[PDB]
């Protein structure tokens, strides 16, 4: 009883591929076969289902991605259309257990890749201070990006606002508490004193290269 | 000095929309003009950009979505189309200082969610455990899903392997240290000794619902 998929490999953003799964060991005819995804580093998700004829798609390929069949060939296909690289992922085929609700034969697994730089870490994720402390954020990028490095707060509901650009220069009107240091890949962002005011999201981004990278973010929540 | 965005909504997958971004108290002709979004509870991620004429697109979108503008009206465009559910995000519209390498005006954001469904919450996230140990990891659905809920195991590089179905009946050829239980909304997996070969990130899954979806997954990682 085997599933062999096969189809996957690199392919640009907006391009379509098809998938394979070519069955064995069982009657394929009888079955509901499903695919579900699981992008790199992440968890399983569910893609799409194909029985006998009602098929289901998630949200996230729905109206791009079509799921077939040829029995005659023990084979179920996914056609995949108009692809991001949130598509990025190994795809698995599965048979679906309808009694059981659980997949008992799964696929090795194809990669797909949907690909045409600089990536930046920003520690901490999140942390806690008082009014009154100082706190340091920092960002690393992977490469060098020189000194264009930004920084932006970010309050709940509001767009982003410029506070720091050019790794240490202020935006008009940014308060003297704030300050930026750093360059080639090691950059940090100070606040002296912390006021009400200050607590917000906060995101480096690179300037350097074409594709601009922001940071992940650091929440400064209230201790 | 304004940026004011329109267009967003509620769109099906597969779907189109378009974004406007309507400029005032500055030079549009001469501004390098970006989008940038940001998806619920997450950070920023830069889109697509245009200046006076080579734009460019984030692989996220590239082939599906085109930037454009209309110097006459002093408004910036986003044509989105084959949408997914991970393009749902608030957009934002932002002026690119080229010389700093930041933006230094930014729109107040539209929303774009895009949607034609039990949430999985799986517990702990990873934990760190011995040979011998005994182990319980934790399964939470939003909504009842009765007795249909599933657990598989996933090695490095390997498809997941059915485990449990139906809460706690066992595949065959499972060993007997893995047990599970529960009912409706809270489900538990126990492995009672822990041996080397057990050592992977464990999956629940519900299938009581035609959206058949899984929990984020527990690593079961070596002290």
């Known amino acids: 009883v085997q599933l062999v998929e096969s189809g996957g490999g690199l392919v640009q953003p907006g391009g379509s591929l098809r998938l394979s799964c070519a069955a064995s060991?069982?009657?394929?005819?009888?079955?509901?076969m499903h695919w579900v995804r699981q992008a790199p580093g992440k968890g399983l998700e569910w893609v799409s289902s194909?029985?006998?004829?009602?098929?289901y798609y998630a949200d996230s390929v729905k109206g791009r991605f079509t799921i077939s069949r040829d029995n005659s060939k023990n084979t179920l296909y996914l056609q995949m259309n108009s692809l991001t690289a949130e598509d990025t992922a190994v795809y698995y085929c599965?048979?679906?257990?309808?009694?059981?609700?659980?997949?008992?034969?799964w696929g090795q697994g194809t990669l797909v890749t949907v690909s045409s730089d600089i990536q930046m870490t920003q520690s901490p994720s999140s942390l806690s201070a008082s009014v009154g402390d100082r706190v340091t954020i920092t960002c690393?990028?992977?490469?060098?990006?020189?000194?264009?490095?930004?920084?932006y707060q970010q309050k709940p509901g509001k767009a982003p606002k410029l506070?720091?650009?050019?790794?240490?220069?202020?935006?008009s009107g940014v308060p003297s508490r704030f300050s930026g240091s750093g360059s080639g890949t090691d950059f940090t962002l100070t606040i002296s004193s912390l006021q009400p005011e200050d607590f917000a999201t906060?995101?480096?981004?690179?300037?350097?290269?074409?594709?601009?990278?922001?940071?992940?973010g650091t929440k400064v929540e209230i201790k | 000095v304004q940026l004011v965005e329109s267009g967003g909504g509620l769109v099906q997958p597969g779907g189109s929309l378009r974004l406007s971004c309507?400029?005032?108290?500055?030079?549009?002709?001469?501004?390098?003009?970006?989008?940038v979004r940001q998806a619920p509870g997450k950070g920023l991620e830069w889109?697509?950009?245009?200046?006076?004429?080579?734009?460019?697109?984030?692989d996220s979108v590239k082939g599906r979505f085109t930037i454009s503008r209309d110097n006459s009206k002093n408004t910036l465009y986003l044509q989105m189309n084959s949408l997914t559910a991970e393009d749902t995000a608030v957009?934002?519209?932002?002026?690119?200082?080229?010389?700093?390498?930041?933006?230094?005006?930014?729109?107040?954001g539209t929303l774009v969610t895009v949607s034609s469904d039990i949430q999985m919450t799986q517990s702990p996230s990873s934990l760190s455990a011995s040979v011998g140990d005994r182990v319980t990891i934790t399964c939470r659905a939003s909504?009842?899903?009765?007795?249909?809920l599933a657990w598989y195991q996933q090695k490095p590089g390997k498809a997941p392997k059915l485990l449990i179905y139906?809460?706690?009946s066992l595949q065959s050829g499972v060993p007997s240290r893995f047990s599970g239980s529960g009912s409706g909304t809270d489900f538990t997996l126990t492995i009672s000794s822990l041996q080397p070969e057990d050592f992977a990130t464990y999956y629940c899954?519900?299938?009581?619902?035609?959206?058949?979806?899984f929990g984020q997954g527990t690593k079961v990682e070596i002290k």
């Open positions: 599965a048979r679906f257990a309808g009694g059981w609700g659980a997949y008992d034969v």
């Open positions: 060991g069982f009657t394929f005819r009888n079955s509901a």
């Open positions: 194909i029985w006998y004829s009602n098929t």
């Open positions: 909504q009842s899903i009765g007795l249909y």
């Open positions: 139906a809460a706690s």
């Open positions: 899954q519900q299938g009581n619902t035609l959206s058949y979806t």
